[PDB]
Structures are given as C-alpha cells and as structure tokens.
Amino acid sequence: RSAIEDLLFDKVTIADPGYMQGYDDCMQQGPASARDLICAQYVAGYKVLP
Amino acid sequence: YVDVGPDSVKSACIEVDIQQTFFDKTWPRPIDVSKADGIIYPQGRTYSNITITYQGLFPYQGDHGDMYVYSAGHATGTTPQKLFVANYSQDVKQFANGFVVRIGAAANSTGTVIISPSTSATIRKIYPAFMLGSSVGNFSDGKMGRFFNHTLVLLPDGCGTLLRAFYCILEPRSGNHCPAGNSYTSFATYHTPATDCSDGNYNRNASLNSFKEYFNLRNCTFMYTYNITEDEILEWFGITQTAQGVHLFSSRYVDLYGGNMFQFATLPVYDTIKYYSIIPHSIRSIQSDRKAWAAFYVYKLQPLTFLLDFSVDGYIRRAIDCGFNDLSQLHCSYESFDVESGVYSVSSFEAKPSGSVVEQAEGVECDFSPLLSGTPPQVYNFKRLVFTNCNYNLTKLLSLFSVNDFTCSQISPAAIASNCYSSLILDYFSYPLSMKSDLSVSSAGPISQFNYKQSFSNPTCLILATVPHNLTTITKPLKYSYINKCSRFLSDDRTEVPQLVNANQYSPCVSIVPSTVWEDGDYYRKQLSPLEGGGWLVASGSTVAMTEQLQMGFGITVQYGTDTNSVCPKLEFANDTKIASQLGNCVEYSLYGVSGRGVFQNCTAVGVRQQRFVYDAYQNLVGYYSDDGNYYCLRACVSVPVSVIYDKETKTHATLFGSVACEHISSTMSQYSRSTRSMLKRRDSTYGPLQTPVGCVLGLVNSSLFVEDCKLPLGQSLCALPDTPS
Amino acid sequence: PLKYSYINKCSRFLSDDRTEVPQLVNANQYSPCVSIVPSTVWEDGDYYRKQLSPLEGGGWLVASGSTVAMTEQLQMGFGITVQYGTDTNSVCPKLEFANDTKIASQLGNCVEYSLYGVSGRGVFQNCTAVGVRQQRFVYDAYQNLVG
Amino acid sequence: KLASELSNTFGAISASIGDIIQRLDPPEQDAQIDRLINGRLTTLNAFVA
C-alpha cells in the first residue's frame, strides 16, 4: 500500500480489525487490555461482514 | 353403566411367554416432512394453492419413531398352544402432547414371521391396541403396566373392520396366569382366526372377550364403536388431549391417499392422561397357517412451527420443519420452498456452558431469638432486625408458627428464601387476624395509613401467623391496638394537617400515643414546639380483643448489593470440587449471590482493592478480586457466528463458521445451534475443516481457481463456485 | 351435601423429609391430589398422606381440607365457558327463522350473514369448488373468508 | 448504541432475563419478560431504519 495511504491509516483512531484472529481476540488468549467493540460483537450477536 | 355384556367364562388365562428377543429388529422410519408425513390437518379451515406458516402439534422431521410388531403366538402341528409375545406390556411412557402412528406401511410386501422367522411369510396390515390413563404402578408380582382408576381402552375387535373404545375400571383376575393370580407373567390379548373373523360372521367380540379373560371390567363409563373397511393402503392415526376431551385423528376418512390427518372423533373424557402404553396381542393361528404382519410405528407430537404447502385441492403436500436445520430456518424466514441463491446469516452457537463455581460465604447462623419470647409490638411500635454476615434457613422458622397469610411482592417466595443479600430485614409485630382484611403491602387500611409502610424500591414479603400452644414463652398483649388517626392541628384553629406514615419509618404521632390504647376511640394530643411553628400533635386509636393464641405479622424486605452480600441461606460447598481459577470454556457462576456465566483468568490487579467486583462503563462485570490473593478477570464467553452459502441452481449448500478458526471446530457440537447439521454432512462426513483468510469453513474444497465473478463471494479474495449445470 | 367442603392443601414432601413443593391446580383440570382425597371432607382440617414410589420420583403426597356448614336450601355455583371453533360451530340458540323469508340467496348486495355463528357481511356467488371438503369455510393467507 | 441498550431496562425489574426468571413466579415472570422483549424489538426497528 502506498506510504500516503499508510499515513492516513496511522492517523486514524479506529479500533483494531476483526476477521483474523477475530473470535480469539475476544477470548482470554490475548492481552487483558483489549477494549475493542469487535470483542463485544460476540456478546451482542453482531456480525461484521468483511 | 355401559352394557359391556357378560363377564369372562373363566378366571383362568392362557399362559403368556415373553419372546422379546425374536422381535429385536431394526427398521427405522424417519418422517418425510416434504411429503407431509405425520401432518395433522389444521382445524376447520382450508386453503388454496397458497402456502402459509402454521403452529401446532407435529412430529420432528428426523423422528424414526418407535417400532412394534404384532405376531402369531405359539402353535404346533394343527393346534394353538401358549402365547408368544414381545415385552410390550412393560413399555409405559409418559403421555406427551399426543402421538401419531403409521399403520400398514409395509403392506403388499414380504417379511418374516419373527417368532418363527424360519418361515419368511408375506406381511400384512394389522391394527394396534392401546391404554391411556393418569396413573401407573406395579402388579402384585412387581410387574410393570398396572393402571389405576379408569383407563382408556382402545382396540380393534376381531377384524380391523370394528374399532372399540372404552373408559372403565380394570379388575385383576386371580386365575392361572392372571393379573391377581400367583402364576401371572404378563398380560396379553389374542385373536383366533380359525373361528374369529369368519367370512360369513366376523367375530365382533373376539378381542374384547380375550381381554375380558384377563381383566374384569368395573364401572364402565364410556363405550364407542366404529365401522372400518379393509384396505391395505397406509393409514395414519393420532391422539391428543385438550380441555375439550380426547381427540382422535385419522387419514382414512378424508385423505386416504395424501395421509393428512383429520379429527375423526372426540371423547368426553376430561381426565388428564399422564401415561401411555401399547397393548400386546397375539394371533392363535395354526403353525402351518402363520402369517407375518407389517411393522407398526409410533411418533411423538410437539408444538412446532411449519411452512405448509397447500395444494389447490386443499391437501397439504409439503412441509418445512423450521427448527430442524439452519437451512430450514431460511426457508421458513422467506416463507418459500425456493430461496434465492446467496449467502445468508443464520442463528449463532450458544458457546457450550459448563459446571458452576461459587465464592459465596462466610458467616454464622442468624440468631432469630428476639422472636422467641415476650409480647410482640403494637402496630406503631415495630421491632426490627437487621441481618448481615450470617446464614439462614427460614423453614426452621416456619415450623415455629402456623402461617395464615403469605404474600410476596416483586419476588417469588421461593426465591426470596434462596437468594443471598447485602441485608435481610425483618419487622415483626402483634397483629389480630380480625384486622387481616385491612393489611396488604398495597392496602388502603388505617394500619398502612398511619402505622406502617414499606418501600417498593426493594422486593417485599408479608407473613401473618399465630402461636402454637407449645410456644408459650411468647406472650399476648393485653389488647391488640392501633393508631387510626395521625394529624397535627394548625395553630390557627381552623385547619388540620394529616400525617400518613412514611415508608420504613415510625409515625411522628408515636411520641404521644401510649404503649397500648387504653380504650377504643381514645385520642391524644401534644403541643408542637415553637420550632415547628406551634399547633398540636393529634392521634387516636382503636383496639381488638385478645385471642386464645397470639396472632402476629411480619414484614420482610431485602437489600441488593455486590461485595456487601454477606447474608445468605446456609450453604454447603462440598464436592464442587473447584471454584475460581478453574476452566472450562464457559462456566456458570455465582459470587456472593451475583449470578452470571463466563470464563475466568488469572490476570493482573487493578484497584480499588477489596471491592471485589469490577465494572464496565455499561455496567458489565469486568472482573473479580478474590480470596486466593489473585485478581481474576472475566471474559464472559465468546459466541460463534454462522452463515450459509446457498445455490438453488444446483440445490446445494455449504457453511461458514465466521472467524472462529478450525481449532474450535468439531464434527458435532454441544455448542449448540439447531437440532441437526446432517444436510452438510451429505458431503462433509468425509472431509476435514478448511481454514480460510476470513475463517474456517466446511465443504468448500480448495481448487485454487481464478474466477472474476462467482456471484457467491465471501468477501476479501474468497469466492466459491456452484457445481456445474445439468 | 352433609357439609360444603374443599381441598386447602396439595403438595409433595421431598424424600429427605424437610423440603416441600406445592402442586397448584391446572386450569380446566382436576388437581392431582384428588387421587387421595375422600369424596367429601369428613371433618374440618382432615389430612392424608401417600408415600410415593421411586417410579413416582419419591417423597410423600400431602393433602388437607376444610368445611362449611350446610344450609336449608342448597347453595350452588357454576362456571361457564364457551369455545369458538371454525367448522364445528354447531351450538346455537334456538332459531327464530319462522315467519321470515327464503334464504340465503339474494345476489343481491353484500348482505350481512351468519353461518354457524360466523358473523360477517358479504356477497356470494355460485362459483366452482376449491379444496377441501367438509372444512366448510375457506380462507385466505390474510385470515379472510374466501368461501 | 445497540450494545448500550442491552443493559437498558424497559420497566422490567432487571435488564437480565435470567435474573428476572430466577426471582419470579411464572404468571408474573413473563409480564416482565414481555416488557423487555418489546423494548428490545423497538430499538432494533429504529436501528434498521
């Protein structure tokens, strides 16, 4: 990806993405500091499509 | 009662031998819901070629049913001998929303004699007999299937052309091989083709009489007969029960060919059926004249929802069992038997829950001793006990008094006894039961107007009770008394200010009122202090006569909390065997009476220390500080998203498990979603899971082909191809 | 009756002889405890118990009852309910059809009607048949009568 | 927004369904359940729009 696209992505404050590892980034096999709505996806019954 | 005819010619019974092992055959018959098999037609209505959904009592699509086979008994040479039957007499089942049966399906084919298979005889349609009732138990010999009071007797009699139903009491017989006799084995009925069913005289009492030979009918309330024609075509029959009586359904009368069942008849019996069993029967056919019979099946009905395909001819031809499979879910959601191709979202997995753990405790038993002696207070004098840090068993207290009124607001009484709390509060008082008409937590009576009120912020309960003659350490008030007025006069001598009692507070008027009211209608006054602006306190009261046994009431309220919940029911923690820090994948839990489920991990600490519970900005528990010296945290559990790939052009499908990855995938699951996944297994019983960049899938096959438009794309670069055209 | 009477208890004792669970009556059905209770209550506060078999799940059935004095003229109560079916609505008040006119043809305007208690108004036509027989009434997907 | 509504009582005694089931007699239990169900459906309708 171009460096300019990456500058944009770095300045954006968006939560870390789903898909991989997805379900296992909700789960205890990951950092205790995650605060992603993506883990809340598996509580609320939400699904985020790719 | 019903003229059932003469009693049995003899008390003796033909001996019954159990030959069950001969009947151990495996011929399962699943329901072709696509053919409307087992479908009971809707009550009183009909439709055109339109399709609709419908809810009612139906069999599951995958139900193979229970199989029973009737056969000839023992006979040798040219004569009948002893009865050879299956152990069906022991098959007592609970009645469960009705059932339907399959009769004569294998007619016009061959099978075996079973009891003497060494014959391989052709098979024919044979009719079943049944018994239903509200109670069962053992015979004097410890045998199964004895029914009580009145039972519903259902049987064909002689040939299938006659059907009889009875509602009557069965009396055991003391003869040889008979229910009350001491040579009894097991009850059975029989038919004798040599004389029964004669071409010029069918024995309309054949079966009834052979029944009578084992039991004596007493008090026969109901009796019905039906005329039936002989036709080897498959018939359906079912039984349900409502407050309107017993309902009999059959396909024969209306839909002999489609198999839809119609309410053939109803019965006046209103007694609830609790048990259901099948009656054993044997044929007395001569050894060389033996005839095999077609298999018979039973299916159970349940309050299920279906998509129904009505023919313009008014018959149901196809149906969809919505809860069977995720695929069926989609058909129901689109009310169609042909869903457009695409990828669709379906219900997710429940993430497989496991055994509970707790951190409840600790405390000592509650010393309820203030209630065990002395005289209880007047309605404005209440005693209160605050309970914290302690354990209880309220039924011990219940044994001490007779309760004449128990009502709880906002909580079941059972739950309030079992719940654990930050506090438990009990208010107690003397109270004549003559005044019980004026007391409820919501009552408009003077007792609640001026003497006591309870907050509705907390769940409450109320108890009225009286003292047993062996509880004399508790004593009576000279009279029961209450304040029937509480107001203050305005200082200007023209107006008056009423004072209703505040919830959870003594009325202000108690400061002037004596400990008992000396006479009914007594009133009292006190001048108000100048800080109050002057005026006069006023109160009045009334009394009720003393009674032989002391009468009293109680008020109960409870208080919710988290780490303050030290009041609990007495608890036993034996054989958990472990609590916090043990997993599991999802586990049930309770911490100090706070229910939930989740998985725990030994993470690091955050403050404030010793507050136990830790919460999110959405008031979701985050974690728990614990007595192992370890902070633990809680992840709840993680659900699995599901999706289904579908292609109506090939009529095929495949599935997606979301981002879960193949490390949590197994061929079957307890996780769980819908009752089957077998339609996927039609190809995927032979293949491993396949990981993909979005996540693990089944049945997609890695061909590594490049196609610019699959019309089934899965996102990213994933794609999938329908199999090729016909 | 000698006295009016009723059951004021019907519960099962747990097999451990401490815990107990009530058995409230089902709507439109006899309470299960009738199996042990006498046809009338002989005395106020009479009670009976039944040991229950492991087939019954154990415990003891427990029941009791109470009475009210008899009166010079019998006092009685009734409960009345009704059920609306579809093609089974054959229970009706006796007909007042006498001294009226021939029915039901008019054909004609969309005339008010009742057929077996099914109220409505509409116009009829002598069309053909659609299935199925002996269901009488025919309906749409919108729960509207068709014919 | 949808996540926050899971904790929103609709006049139900509690936002947890299992909690109200555990604490209530079934004739009244489902009055509370239906208050909750109706409000959950209402937020979904607004969400789709």
PDB file of C-alpha atoms in Angstrom, chain A residues 22-46:
ATOM      1  CA  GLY A  22     -11.499 -12.413  15.369  1.00  0.00           C
ATOM      2  CA  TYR A  23     -13.145 -14.651  17.904  1.00  0.00           C
ATOM      3  CA  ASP A  24      -9.851 -15.407  19.658  1.00  0.00           C
ATOM      4  CA  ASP A  25      -9.176 -11.686  20.193  1.00  0.00           C
ATOM      5  CA  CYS A  26     -12.276 -11.583  22.426  1.00  0.00           C
ATOM      6  CA  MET A  27     -11.164 -14.631  24.324  1.00  0.00           C
ATOM      7  CA  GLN A  28      -8.688 -14.807  27.219  1.00  0.00           C
ATOM      8  CA  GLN A  29      -5.908 -15.955  24.806  1.00  0.00           C
ATOM      9  CA  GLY A  30      -4.854 -12.342  24.116  1.00  0.00           C
ATOM     10  CA  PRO A  31      -4.000  -9.162  26.080  1.00  0.00           C
ATOM     11  CA  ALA A  32      -6.156  -8.129  29.033  1.00  0.00           C
ATOM     12  CA  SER A  33      -6.057  -4.540  27.740  1.00  0.00           C
ATOM     13  CA  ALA A  34      -8.132  -5.044  24.586  1.00  0.00           C
ATOM     14  CA  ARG A  35     -11.218  -2.781  24.640  1.00  0.00           C
ATOM     15  CA  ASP A  36     -12.473  -3.461  21.126  1.00  0.00           C
ATOM     16  CA  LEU A  37     -16.132  -3.401  20.117  1.00  0.00           C
ATOM     17  CA  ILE A  38     -15.061  -6.327  17.980  1.00  0.00           C
ATOM     18  CA  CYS A  39     -14.923  -8.497  21.075  1.00  0.00           C
ATOM     19  CA  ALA A  40     -18.394  -7.135  22.036  1.00  0.00           C
ATOM     20  CA  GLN A  41     -19.526  -8.499  18.645  1.00  0.00           C
ATOM     21  CA  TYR A  42     -19.567 -11.958  20.194  1.00  0.00           C
ATOM     22  CA  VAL A  43     -21.675 -10.892  23.167  1.00  0.00           C
ATOM     23  CA  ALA A  44     -24.246  -8.743  21.399  1.00  0.00           C
ATOM     24  CA  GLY A  45     -24.853 -11.167  18.476  1.00  0.00           C
ATOM     25  CA  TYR A  46     -23.475  -8.630  15.961  1.00  0.00           C
TER      26      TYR A  46
END
